[PDB]
Amino acid sequence: SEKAARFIRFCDSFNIPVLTFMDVPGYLPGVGQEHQGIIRRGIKLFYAYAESTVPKITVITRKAYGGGYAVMGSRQIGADRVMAWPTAEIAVMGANSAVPILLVDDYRRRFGNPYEAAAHGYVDMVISPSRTRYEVARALASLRNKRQARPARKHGNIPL
Amino acid sequence: TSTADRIADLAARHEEAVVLAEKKAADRQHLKGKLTARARIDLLLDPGSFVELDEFVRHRTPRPYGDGVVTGHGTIDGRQVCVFSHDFTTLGGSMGEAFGSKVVKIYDFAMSVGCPVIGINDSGGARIQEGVMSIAYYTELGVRNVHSSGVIPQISLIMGPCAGGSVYSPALTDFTVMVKDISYMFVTGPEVVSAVMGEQVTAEQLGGPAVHAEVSGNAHYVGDDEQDAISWVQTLLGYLPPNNLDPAPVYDHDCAPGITEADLALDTVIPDSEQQVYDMADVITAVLDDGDYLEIHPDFARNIICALGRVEGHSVAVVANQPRHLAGVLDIDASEKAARFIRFCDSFNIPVLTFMDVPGYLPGVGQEHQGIIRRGIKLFYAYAESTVPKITVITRKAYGGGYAVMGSRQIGADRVMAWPTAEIAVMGARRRFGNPYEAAAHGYVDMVISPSRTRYEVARALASLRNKRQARPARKHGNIPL
Amino acid sequence: STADRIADLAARHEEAVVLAEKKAADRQHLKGKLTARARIDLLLDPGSFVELDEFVRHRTPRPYGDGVVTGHGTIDGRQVCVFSHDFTTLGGSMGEAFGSKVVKIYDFAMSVGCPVIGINDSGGARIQEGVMSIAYYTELGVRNVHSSGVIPQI
Ligand SMILES: CCCCCC(=O)SCCNC(=O)CCNC(=O)[C@H](O)C(C)(C)COP(=O)(O)OP(=O)(O)OC[C@H]1O[C@@H](n2cnc3c(N)ncnc32)[C@H](O)[C@@H]1OP(=O)(O)O
């Protein structure tokens, strides 16, 4: 998170578009990461994406769960174009952790695909992987004149 | 049908939304020793000031009113604030689309008029039943935290088990306040940790108030009970402006125009012996009105102090090295605790008052491999970027990089005064260098004063600097190390 | 000893502010002139003067303050910045320490937006310091120019 966060804020400061290739199970839980502050330090990546105003294209190759999906250049966090491969899995959780809240599991493959997210317009395209380059290139071309306003402030108060 | 029928029908829906639902939720949260969402709002807000919004919102597809959250605005000590409060009894407090809509609306209002947002959390995070949609709304909320950052004060009360987005949004707000025994914070709960990683940990070991108040740093304060937490938040708001444009409150004061006994005591507070320590709070209290201050992160990085007080009725931010813990050295934790504090205060135009007694940085493999260079430099960045008035009082040790960082003149402090016990040098030990007079010769300190004049000089410096204005770099934002 | 260190500060304070004022009055009254401090007390409201860089010294006699009294105070309740040359000490000549002290209070006045009164009484440039004395004259001039029409200058 800290590696990618400062990378993104840097690129946003010098107007380099950010292209995200996403396949994320989520944030890493467990006592090691909590006592070291994963809650506020992993969220630095969220701040970085939402703060940025450069064009942002996202390709979802496979896993897209929970906070990982939110942070990794989702549409709601400010991505201009979100395209998904058919192998994309967009859900709040994996089926192994969501269903011990009722093998009524592979009916949780309601979510094992991108088509619910596509139904709500949370992804813009469901493409064959071979068209990725094509679709990235034109998306980047379409976004070069993007302009976005920024909050009126001395500076924000990013978690430290 | 009739007009009277429709008005009686509205009264009936309102009894079900506010009375019946509340009694049901009180019964189920009694199982856990907790108050209800509405009870918490009534403890927080001025009596009779609460205006509830979206009372009759329901999920689309049992569809209770509110979908598990109570939103609205009110006043705290006469000034307007916006509030939302999770209902853990409805689906574990998880956010669905109706839930998220209510929160998104209340945040949009607070951004629109520029008042603080108090979020009262008691939630499992994102509602699994709604899939992508719940994640979408929590992201909208987090985006609004980010666009609010440094624009309106944001305060989170953690008052139950909290996971996922229910800890992610608080982390983006300015202050997180937990409550003893009843609250927790983790990415995901202990049973998911067991099924996935799989470690066998108790909730208190994984993310209890003590873990976050003393180890991770995620909690700025832990209240003994809910009302203690809520009372802390009310006191905190009493120091802060509503937004980053309008001024902080000014209270009247009983400060003494001459020199008192408490001022004279500062002349004897520093021990004669260098390996004897003292309590920096004994210095802090002699300067601040009524000797009072609200301390941020009191149980975390106790080798530095961060507090808000008042000088002549004006809000003042205090950063001070505490010699009673780890000799008052700087480590990673003290650096990041004071760094974020200073940046918050600079965002909201609170002047920073620094008491320096710093022998240097904590040495060791633990510090160096855990990133003391890029994490400790955050305090340097915080000071150098700030434009608020900065006054620094140097009481004793002031060596090397520690001297540089703690609000020296060169890093941008507007006023630096030194006590005769101050030792400003590259390193210690020949004690013709054990004083502030080489620094005073170069002008690096502006004044060498008897300690008892501290309160008098600080008060006059702050007043001299109320109209300070300083230009900022032309940029979208900086690139502070993370 | 802490009490010793405070006592020592009291001693140096009196060689910088009190005794130097006696010697400076003795030599300037001979010429029908007041001293830098007495002029500051005539200018500012009683008890409002806050003196800065009292113990500044030049680098290479190294008197405290290097020949200029600087600080801020009030005139009829409103804030002003002030500097006052001490013609007795080192001729009131422009050195690097001297110029630093005046630059500091000019930066302060530009920072907080208050007028600056400068009381001039000077034999010119400290020649031993060479081009540095020029460098600091120029620095002050530039601050006069960036202040021009922004804060009043007397
Ligand atoms: C600011 C940045 C925002 C970013 C946005 C994001 O990325 S959001 C990240 C995405 N993922 C998350 O937020 C999920 C994190 N939450 C979790 O992992 C889990 O919910 C948990 C750790 C709280 C486990 O809670 P438990 O159910 O074991 O606790 P408990 O048994 O007391 O809960 C009682 C009731 O609440 C239900 N419940 C609890 N959490 C729920 C949830 N998240 N969604 C739906 N239902 C939930 C349970 O079904 C149960 O219902 P019944 O009593 O009726 O049986």
Set down the secondary structure blueprint.
This is part of a larger assembly, with 3 copies of chain A.
Chain A: H1 2-13, E1 18-24, H2 31-35, H3 38-42, H4 44-51, E2 56-65, H5 66-71, E3 81-84, E4 89-91, H6 95-98, H7 115-119, E5 125-126, H8 132-142
Parallel strand pairs in A: 1-2, 2-3, 2-4, 3-5
Helix pairs in contact in A: 1-4
Bound molecules: hexanoyl-coenzyme A (HXC).
Keywords:
160 residues, 8 helices, alpha/beta, flat, part of a larger assembly, 3 chains, Putative carboxyl transferase (chain C), 2-enoyl-CoA Hydratase, Chain A, domain 1, binds hexanoyl-coenzyme A, 16% strand
Notes on the structure:
The structure is cut from a larger assembly and holds 3 copies of chain A. Chain A is α/β, with parallel strands linked by helices and 160 residues long. Helices cover 35% and strands 16% of the residues of chain A. Chain A is built from 8 helices and 5 strands; from the N terminus they run H-E-H-H-H-E-H-E-E-H-H-E-H. The first copy, chain A, has helices at residues 2-13, 31-35, 38-42, 44-51, 66-71, 95-98, 115-119, 132-142, and strands at 18-24, 56-65, 81-84, 89-91, 125-126. In chain A, strands 1, 2, 3, 4 and 5 form a 5-stranded parallel β-sheet that branches. The longest helix of chain A has 12 residues, at 2-13. Chain A starts with a helix and ends in an 18-residue tail after the last helix. In chain A, 42% of the residues are buried. At the A-B interface, helix 1, helix 2, helix 3, helix 4 and helix 5 of A face helix 4, helix 5, helix 6, helix 7 and helix 8 of B. The structure holds hexanoyl-coenzyme A.
